[PDB]
Design an enzyme around this catalytic site. Structure first.
Site, short mmCIF file in Angstrom:
data_model
loop_
_atom_site.label_atom_id
_atom_site.label_comp_id
_atom_site.label_asym_id
_atom_site.label_seq_id
_atom_site.Cartn_x
_atom_site.Cartn_y
_atom_site.Cartn_z
N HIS A 94 5.63 -66.69 -45.48
CA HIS A 94 5.19 -67.31 -44.74
C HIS A 94 4.87 -68.43 -44.75
O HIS A 94 4.61 -69.14 -43.38
CB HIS A 94 3.69 -66.32 -44.85
CG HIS A 94 2.58 -66.80 -45.40
ND1 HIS A 94 3.06 -65.71 -46.62
CD2 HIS A 94 2.30 -67.44 -46.22
CE1 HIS A 94 2.06 -66.11 -47.83
NE2 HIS A 94 0.99 -67.24 -46.74
N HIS B 184 1.00 -76.46 -49.68
CA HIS B 184 2.07 -75.91 -48.60
C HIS B 184 2.16 -76.68 -47.01
O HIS B 184 0.75 -76.96 -46.68
CB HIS B 184 1.53 -74.32 -48.40
CG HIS B 184 0.25 -73.83 -47.56
ND1 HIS B 184 -0.38 -73.61 -48.70
CD2 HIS B 184 -0.20 -73.63 -46.84
CE1 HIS B 184 -2.03 -73.69 -48.21
NE2 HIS B 184 -1.42 -73.61 -46.57
N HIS C 119 1.89 -75.88 -42.59
CA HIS C 119 1.85 -74.91 -40.96
C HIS C 119 3.04 -76.09 -40.11
O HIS C 119 2.88 -76.91 -40.24
CB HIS C 119 0.81 -74.21 -40.67
CG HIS C 119 -0.26 -73.85 -41.86
ND1 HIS C 119 -0.07 -72.47 -42.01
CD2 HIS C 119 -0.71 -74.09 -42.57
CE1 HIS C 119 -0.79 -72.23 -42.84
NE2 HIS C 119 -0.65 -73.34 -43.43
N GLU D 286 -3.12 -76.15 -37.63
CA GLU D 286 -3.87 -75.22 -37.26
C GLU D 286 -5.27 -75.90 -36.94
O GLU D 286 -5.25 -75.54 -35.57
CB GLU D 286 -4.25 -74.56 -38.85
CG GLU D 286 -2.50 -73.67 -39.24
CD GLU D 286 -3.31 -72.63 -39.83
OE1 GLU D 286 -3.87 -72.81 -41.38
OE2 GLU D 286 -2.85 -71.85 -40.21
N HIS E 222 -1.43 -78.44 -46.25
CA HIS E 222 -3.15 -78.06 -47.22
C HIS E 222 -2.49 -78.23 -48.59
O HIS E 222 -1.85 -77.67 -48.95
CB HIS E 222 -2.62 -76.31 -46.27
CG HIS E 222 -3.36 -76.32 -45.48
ND1 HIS E 222 -3.31 -75.31 -44.07
CD2 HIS E 222 -4.07 -77.40 -44.13
CE1 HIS E 222 -4.32 -75.46 -43.68
NE2 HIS E 222 -4.49 -76.87 -43.05
N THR F 198 -6.75 -69.36 -43.83
CA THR F 198 -6.21 -69.34 -42.44
C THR F 198 -4.91 -68.18 -42.84
O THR F 198 -4.72 -68.31 -41.00
CB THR F 198 -6.39 -70.41 -41.62
OG1 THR F 198 -4.29 -70.93 -42.52
CG2 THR F 198 -7.05 -71.14 -42.26
C1 LIG Z 1 -2.93 -68.59 -57.74
O1 LIG Z 1 -2.46 -67.98 -56.42
C2 LIG Z 1 -3.30 -67.15 -56.50
C3 LIG Z 1 -3.77 -67.37 -54.70
C4 LIG Z 1 -5.16 -66.40 -54.57
C5 LIG Z 1 -5.92 -66.54 -53.44
N1 LIG Z 1 -5.34 -67.89 -52.47
C6 LIG Z 1 -5.71 -68.43 -53.01
C7 LIG Z 1 -5.67 -69.92 -51.74
C8 LIG Z 1 -5.43 -69.79 -50.05
C9 LIG Z 1 -4.91 -70.50 -49.70
C10 LIG Z 1 -4.44 -69.57 -48.07
O2 LIG Z 1 -4.08 -70.73 -47.08
S1 LIG Z 1 -5.02 -71.81 -46.14
N2 LIG Z 1 -4.07 -72.03 -44.96
O3 LIG Z 1 -6.09 -71.07 -45.92
O4 LIG Z 1 -4.65 -72.78 -47.41
C11 LIG Z 1 -3.92 -69.27 -47.76
C12 LIG Z 1 -4.38 -68.36 -49.41
C13 LIG Z 1 -5.06 -67.90 -50.46
C14 LIG Z 1 -4.87 -67.20 -51.42
C15 LIG Z 1 -5.48 -65.42 -55.90
C16 LIG Z 1 -5.12 -65.57 -56.25
O5 LIG Z 1 -5.18 -64.37 -57.24
C17 LIG Z 1 -6.14 -65.23 -58.72
C18 LIG Z 1 -3.62 -66.46 -56.87
O6 LIG Z 1 -3.31 -66.33 -58.44
C19 LIG Z 1 -1.88 -66.25 -59.14
ZN LIG Z 2 -3.01 -73.55 -44.83
#
Ligand SMILES: COc1cc(C[n+]2ccc3cc(OS(N)(=O)=O)ccc3c2)cc(OC)c1OC
Ligand SMILES: [Zn+2]
Length: 257
Positions: free
Chosen positions: A61, A91, A93, A103, A116, A195
């Site tokens: 994604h 990352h 968008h 976004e 972000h 998001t």
């Molecule tokens: C380190 O990556 C993890 C992220 C996550 C959850 N996570 C963190 C940050 C995120 C940021 C995201 O994007 S945003 N667009 O809101 O900045 C989307 C999903 C995310 C989901 C859980 C984990 O398990 C403990 C992880 O360990 C592998």
């Molecule tokens: Zn993001």
């Protein structure tokens, strides 16, 4: 599985993640004339001098660069934050055209992309615990407009060939994220959510006023990535942005007059 297509895109996410219709969803439109200047907000403190990047990854994604978050090396503090937040990943968008891709929007204006930088609150010990907390994460958002090249982004651009399709990853050491920051750290802030799924309402958003410029040649290298895995029908990774959500009972605060 969720994505950004006609049949699995953001308008569908609520079926699998009902919090998609929650009270503090992101992103939002920032109305600059109704955001409130708050002189009690502190300046941001960004300490990225000791950052250790590890890997760059196409997760199907977006693409992301991950950092060592086993110690307080690259941290964010100050601004509206209490306590110390460690940099985990960044990352982007982006859009199919230069007129869309961000976004957040500013007075309904869309930018070509949005960066972000994701941080988590060390009070909670690990990022999995932090996503369960109202103040678990802080995401620093930076707008990209198309103009002059950003030299500090080019080493990201040059490696994207090697992570074209879902699930590819590559070593990506010694990248300094300070090369991606604008000169001003003036910001808006509001309480919001992830998001992408799981859309958890755990994020303090910090959105910088000042965009960075990137060149048309840089941004179109983003548009050559694929959503699909290797050996599947090719589907370009573009328009991986969620549209703005209702602000509801929230106030956007500004660090600047
Ligand atoms: C380190 O990556 C993890 C992220 C996550 C959850 N996570 C963190 C940050 C995120 C940021 C995201 O994007 S945003 N667009 O809101 O900045 C989307 C999903 C995310 C989901 C859980 C984990 O398990 C403990 C992880 O360990 C592998
Ligand atoms: Zn993001």
């Amino acid at each position: 599985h969720w994505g950004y297509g006609k049949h699995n895109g953001p308008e569908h996410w609520h079926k699998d993640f009902p919090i998609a219709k929650g009270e503090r969803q992101s992103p939002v439109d920032i109305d600059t004339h109704t955001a409130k200047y708050d002189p009690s907000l502190k300046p941001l403190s960004v300490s990225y001098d000791q950052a250790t990047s590890l890997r760059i990854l196409n997760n199907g994604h977006s693409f992301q660069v991950t950092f060592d978050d086993s110690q307080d090396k690259a941290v964010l503090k100050g601004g509206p934050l209490d306590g110390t937040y460690r940099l985990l990943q960044f990352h982007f968008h982006w859009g199919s055209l230069d007129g869309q891709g961000s976004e957040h929007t500013v007075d309904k204006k869309k930018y070509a992309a949005e960066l972000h930088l994701v941080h988590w609150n060390t009070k909670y010990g690990d990022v999995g615990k932090a996503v369960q907390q109202p103040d678990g994460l802080a995401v620093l958002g930076i707008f990209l407009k198309v103009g002059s090249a950003k030299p500090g982004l080019q080493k990201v651009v040059d490696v994207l060939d090697s992570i074209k399709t879902e699930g590819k990853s590559a070593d990506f050491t010694n990248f300094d994220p300070r090369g991606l920051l604008p000169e001003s750290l003036d910001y808006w802030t509001y309480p919001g959510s992830l998001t992408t799924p799981p859309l958890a309402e755990c994020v303090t958003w910090i959105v910088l006023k000042e965009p960075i410029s990137v060149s048309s040649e840089q941004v179109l290298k983003f548009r050559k990535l694929n959503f699909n895995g290797e050996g599947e029908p090719e589907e370009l990774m573009v328009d991986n942005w969620r549209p703005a959500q209702p602000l509801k009972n929230r106030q956007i605060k500004a660090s600047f007059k």
